[PDB]
Write a protein that binds this ligand. Sequence first.
Ligand SMILES: CO[C@H]1/C=C/O[C@@]2(C)Oc3c(C)c(O)c4c(c3C2=O)C2=NC3(CCN(CC(C)C)CC3)NC2=C(NC(=O)/C(C)=C/C=C/[C@H](C)[C@H](O)[C@@H](C)[C@@H](O)[C@@H](C)[C@H](OC(C)=O)[C@@H]1C)C4=O
Ligand SMILES: CO[C@H]1/C=C/O[C@@]2(C)Oc3c(C)c(O)c4c(c3C2=O)C2=NC3(CCN(CC(C)C)CC3)NC2=C(NC(=O)/C(C)=C\C=C\[C@H](C)[C@H](O)[C@@H](C)[C@@H](O)[C@@H](C)[C@H](OC(C)=O)[C@@H]1C)C4=O
Ligand SMILES: CCCCCCCCCCCCCCCCCCCC(=O)O[C@H](COC(=O)CCCCCCCCCCCCCC)COP(=O)(O)OCCN
Ligand SMILES: CCCCCCCCCCCCO[C@@H]1O[C@H](CO)[C@@H](O[C@H]2O[C@H](CO)[C@@H](O)[C@H](O)[C@H]2O)[C@H](O)[C@H]1O
Ligand SMILES: CCCCCCCCCC(=O)OC[C@H](CO)OC(=O)CCCCCCCCC
Ligand SMILES: CCCCCCCC
Ligand SMILES: CCCCCCCC
Ligand SMILES: CCCCCC
Lengths: 48, 1034, 48, 156
Amino acid sequence: EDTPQFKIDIDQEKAQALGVSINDINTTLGAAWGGSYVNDFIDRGRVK
Amino acid sequence: MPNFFIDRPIFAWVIAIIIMLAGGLAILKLPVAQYPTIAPPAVTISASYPGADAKTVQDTVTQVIEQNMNGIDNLMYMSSNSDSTGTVQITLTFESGTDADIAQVQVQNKLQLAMPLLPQEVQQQGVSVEKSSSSFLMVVGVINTDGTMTQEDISDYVAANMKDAISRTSGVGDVQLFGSQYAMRIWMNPNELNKFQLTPVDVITAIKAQNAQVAAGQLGGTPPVKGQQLNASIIAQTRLTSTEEFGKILLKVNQDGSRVLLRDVAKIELGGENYDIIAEFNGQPASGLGIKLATGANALDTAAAIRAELAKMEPFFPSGLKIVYPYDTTPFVKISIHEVVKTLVEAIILVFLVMYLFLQNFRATLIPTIAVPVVLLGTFAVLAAFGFSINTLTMFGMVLAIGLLVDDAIVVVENVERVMAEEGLPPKEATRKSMGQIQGALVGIAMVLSAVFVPMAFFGGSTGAIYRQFSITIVSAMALSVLVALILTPALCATMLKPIAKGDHGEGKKGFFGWFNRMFEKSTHHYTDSVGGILRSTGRYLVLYLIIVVGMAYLFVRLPSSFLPDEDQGVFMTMVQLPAGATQERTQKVLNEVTHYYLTKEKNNVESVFAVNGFGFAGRPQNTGIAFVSLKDWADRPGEENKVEAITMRATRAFSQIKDAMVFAFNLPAIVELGTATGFDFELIDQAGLGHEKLTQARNQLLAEAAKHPDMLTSVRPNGLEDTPQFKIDIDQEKAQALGVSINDINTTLGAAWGGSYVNDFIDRGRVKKVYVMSEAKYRMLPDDIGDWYVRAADGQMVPFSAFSSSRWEYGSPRLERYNGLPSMEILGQAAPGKSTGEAMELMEQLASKLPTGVGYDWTGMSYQERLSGNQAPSLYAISLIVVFLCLAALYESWSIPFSVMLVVPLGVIGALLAATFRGLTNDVYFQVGLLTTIGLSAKNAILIVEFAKDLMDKEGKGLIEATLDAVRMRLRPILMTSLAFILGVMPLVISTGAGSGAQNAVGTGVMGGMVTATVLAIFFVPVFFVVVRRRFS
Amino acid sequence: LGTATGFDFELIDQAGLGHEKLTQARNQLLAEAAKHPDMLTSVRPNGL
Amino acid sequence: GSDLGKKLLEAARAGRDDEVRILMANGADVNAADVVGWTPLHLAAYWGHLEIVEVLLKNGADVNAYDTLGSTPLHLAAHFGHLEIVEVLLKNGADVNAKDDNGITPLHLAANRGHLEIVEVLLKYGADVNAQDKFGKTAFDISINNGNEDLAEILQ
Ligand SMILES: CO[C@H]1/C=C/O[C@@]2(C)Oc3c(C)c(O)c4c(c3C2=O)C2=NC3(CCN(CC(C)C)CC3)NC2=C(NC(=O)/C(C)=C/C=C/[C@H](C)[C@H](O)[C@@H](C)[C@@H](O)[C@@H](C)[C@H](OC(C)=O)[C@@H]1C)C4=O
Ligand SMILES: CO[C@H]1/C=C/O[C@@]2(C)Oc3c(C)c(O)c4c(c3C2=O)C2=NC3(CCN(CC(C)C)CC3)NC2=C(NC(=O)/C(C)=C\C=C\[C@H](C)[C@H](O)[C@@H](C)[C@@H](O)[C@@H](C)[C@H](OC(C)=O)[C@@H]1C)C4=O
Ligand SMILES: CCCCCCCCCCCCCCCCCCCC(=O)O[C@H](COC(=O)CCCCCCCCCCCCCC)COP(=O)(O)OCCN
Ligand SMILES: CCCCCCCCCCCCO[C@@H]1O[C@H](CO)[C@@H](O[C@H]2O[C@H](CO)[C@@H](O)[C@H](O)[C@H]2O)[C@H](O)[C@H]1O
Ligand SMILES: CCCCCCCCCC(=O)OC[C@H](CO)OC(=O)CCCCCCCCC
Ligand SMILES: CCCCCCCC
Ligand SMILES: CCCCCCCC
Ligand SMILES: CCCCCC
């Protein structure tokens, strides 16, 4: 069935006035709430 | 077996019914197309480097892909093009019989691994791998009459609202969009950019940032805090969906507080991805859909389904939008079937008349009327089993076989009618004795005709693919005819035919039939007296035989060779070629003049003109164009003066007046996917890294030597383009580093502005589409405009492009060709009138050996096909002749007697050559298969004469001349009956001038002329052959 | 098919021990294999 | 843009001596040019056709004619290493110190591709060795950057 969607809206001009890049804003929001795959590591001789 | 089915007529009827049902089932299920897969499996790798020159495309894309095309199965050769449109086409042609899907996936897979080696701009555009060997079923044109839509606007609607629905239609293989969907075009301004201290780099950076998908996450996503109630997806920034949104893209913020947007330094509108093509349909803007037929699909059903689905879209079209059908092969295939069905029905009607003319009873005339459809139905079932389609080649394969099918019916029934007349036996006993005389011969004839036709299937390449269609069709039709002649027809004769009194030849009757019987009986006595006179002085006819054999060999060399006859398909092409370096506008004016001619002068013939500016099959520069002329229906264009060939010659002579434009009209070939397939296709190869200039000098050296032999070579053109002036610009590194201007910013500003740059995607009404940034036309036309572009240095000052660059004029290739990995230049040409292709190819090899060091050559396309196909021919001719001899030797139980049969071959061939030479036709495939059927039926007639003559000498102990005279007396009636029916049967095909007339003329003329000589000569000459051979070898 | 009397053995690391522990386990197998000349002949590591 | 003029351009480019001879007799335009502004002499000098350069000059071809970017036939002859054509042009009064739009002389172009014999011929006919381009670089500055020991020794 149709689910509720939480539409956040980033103000880029207001962000540029305060002096923050949207790449940092998008990565911060994306990494925090959704998670972010950074790179691989070796857990007991297996890539994870 | 004949004796078995005479006592069991119901079991014979059961086999007849099973064949008819299997045949009837096949007719419903059998695929339908114009032509089958004839051209070898080809896979074209297509890529695009926007704003890239030929060398840039070659040295970053083409060479890299070529180097990675290894470990791919059944690859014959690889040819590629790299041109200044910023395009590459790498075509890998494969062995005949290779799986095109396995061929494509192996090429696709090796390309995928080479993608990281290509430039990012090429990877972003991406590379397509398609089958290029297939052809179009129809081209659906889409136009705008009210003039509210451009070609860009029409193309977008077709992509959005039509293409997908046409692709989902039943039997549709592939759909190509004649144009492109919308693209968000940012038309940059160097004056406005320099005003606010900005560059195309700043425009690209802003668009990438403010138009993109952003991953966010979820409210109450796993792992959650225990006691969480709500779980919802967080939606962040999605892609922009309008020109207004792109207009409001923020580039810079000034000290005073004013906002520098993207609409303040550029014009923003929905346009096309590429502006090279300007397609028009009778002046109006136009797009279209090239539709290809799916595998095993019915061409008649698919075309009807396409028209049905287009009808459903009618209410949803904008005002003034109309569908048109400039190219459609289905009407042609509709006539092709109707004419072949007519020929087969007329053939059965002519047998009914001729059977009633001689035998004079309705019960006799019904036996062929049942037997012939049973064989024809059965043939479709055998074609279905072999996986063949109902096409032009298979359909004319049936028509050429009619002569053999009709004979089997007449020979069996007529012989039964004769036995009843002479001996006075009842139908059942008469059929047993009649079949006893011919059953051995009919099996022998089957094996002889097998040895003639079966080896034709084992030719290699495109030629062998066509020969295979006729071979399997004729062998299958002939084979079933022999089975029906031994199973069904004997049962029908024994059950249906009435008894005839001894010595009753209808001489006691009155009227027309009474006169005919008395006339024919005396005509038979005149014939026997004539043959008697011939056999007294045989030596004189052996001299006349040699004159025919010398006359045959003479006409073979004189008659010019071709592939297939050019057909009036209701469409033809008119190429426009302006001088090198000529612009799109100059080409348009010539196309407008060409379109004006056809709508004015040929208004009674021409329906429409599809003027495609900046298009060509050997490169797509601005100077070249083409016009696809679509004609009215065949009924609306009566006479030879209103046909394509006549309109072509009138058009070409009219446009020769025009200056600064090479304009020629020309007809399509028979098999449009293959081409002309007449001349030769030569490749001149750089074998030792000489370079472009030295390969050009070597090409000019070969073309110069080719011109010195008009007697051998003619029409020798290179397929490539000539070098053109190009604007070389050298970026000074020291001056760029001194002023503090990065090379990335310089090369991006130049590339993005003048060439264009595909930035990222955007969503237009729920459809992903490209975003291009490029200079507005007026700021990138002339060398003076280079200085108007400014790039920002590190210190912030705007440096003009002139400050750190120097420019000059030089010559370079607008289209670089490569063959089998090395650089090449493709050269065309054909053999001079009188000379064969073999001689012309042999001289080109001799002239090639005298070219400079490190310059090699190779043969491609049909030249590669014919060289491998040519070597196989002697062996297949040899196998045919040897097995025919061996089969006849087993039949007669004699090594010498077979020669009496095999000496008939020239009697049929000479007439075909005279008819072709008189009417002025070529030695095409239709003619060549036509000879085999004429030779086959003439050989069949001779076999029954020799069998009867030999059986009289062996069993009844008669003398040589007595047996020969008694033999040809008995065989006179059935040979005249078959010939009278079959000559009248193919008469409509000779006089036909309508749709598919070229093929009908080629099939008809050769067979008619051949059958007239084969009938008239053989009745006199077969007596001579048998007596001379019998006398010579005891 | 290879040689007439030859065999091709593969010592596997199942529990994710490491390279050092597998080498020690390999040397233990080669050592015990050398103690039976009557059965096994020229039992050697294929790798480096 | 005459009919014979366009045929002379294509003939001079290809190097058809026999066709050029016929076109000079029929009175083909020697001062005819394409869109970039190249005369038959420009094309003949570029592709290195010695005979056609000699034939065109005898039929009153402009030796100091320049394209839309100011390049003369002496530039093209000097740049692409055609020693014979450079001598023939200079004998018929070719401007040895001819500057294009970028200030690049024939000496600069000959120096860049390291055509030693042509540099000596240009210097003989009075080539300004201290002539600078738009970036202030002499023929010597090109030789040291390219790393040509022989050329640097000659340009003393
Ligand atoms: C007067 O001689 C020229 C006519 C020009 O007029 C045009 C308008 O009629 C054409 C006809 C009737 C054609 O069948 C072709 C072309 C043209 C013309 O261009 C081609 N055009 C090009 C594409 C455009 N450039 C031209 C450019 C250099 C200015 C190269 C040629 N390729 C062309 C073809 N396919 C190929 O390349 C290959 C690989 C296919 C097979 C090759 C054989 C050997 C030829 O097909 C042969 C049977 C014959 O057709 C030619 C020898 C033809 O001479 C005739 C009519 O005998 C000349 C081409 C063609 O099949
Ligand atoms: C109406 O389109 C047809 C015209 C026929 O009429 C003729 C008589 O007029 C032509 C004209 C005016 C041409 O300029 C050319 C040809 C023909 C004809 O034949 C070619 N004939 C050939 C030479 C022979 N090979 C097969 C060979 C293995 C035996 C293919 C055809 N290619 C041909 C060319 N030269 C090339 O550059 C080559 C070597 C490659 C071209 C690549 C194209 C992009 C693809 O191959 C493919 C996607 C498609 O575009 C063609 C197949 C197209 O067919 C369709 C269905 O669209 C025909 C050109 C041509 O430039
Ligand atoms: C690559 C191209 C294709 C390759 C093709 C290769 C061909 C292989 C060679 C076969 C050549 C066969 C052609 C000659 C056939 C003549 C048959 C007539 C024989 C004959 O004189 O017998 C009379 C009629 O026989 C009859 O008519 C019926 C009775 C005889 C039946 C047996 C005949 C042999 C079967 C035919 C097929 C052979 C090939 C199979 C691979 C008397 O009759 P009778 O007194 O003998 O009747 C009692 C049966 N006992
Ligand atoms: C396109 C090729 C040109 C057409 C060629 C046509 C060839 C077929 C026509 C055969 C016509 C046969 O016609 C026949 O000829 C022979 C001559 O040999 C005549 O025979 C006559 O001369 C011979 C001489 O030896 C006598 O033995 C015989 O008694 C006498 O009647 C016949 O009276 C005549 O009926
Ligand atoms: C009764 C003996 C007849 C045997 C004839 C066999 C010849 C055909 C061989 C074959 O398979 O090739 C078919 C071929 C395919 O193009 O068709 C043909 O080209 C038709 C054959 C031409 C006529 C031959 C007689 C003239 C001799 C100088
Ligand atoms: C509309 C005709 C379909 C059947 C094709 C086959 C007829 C021989
Ligand atoms: C006529 C072709 C076959 C030749 C072999 C038979 C000789 C008697
Ligand atoms: C193959 C033919 C041989 C016959 C000799 C009598």
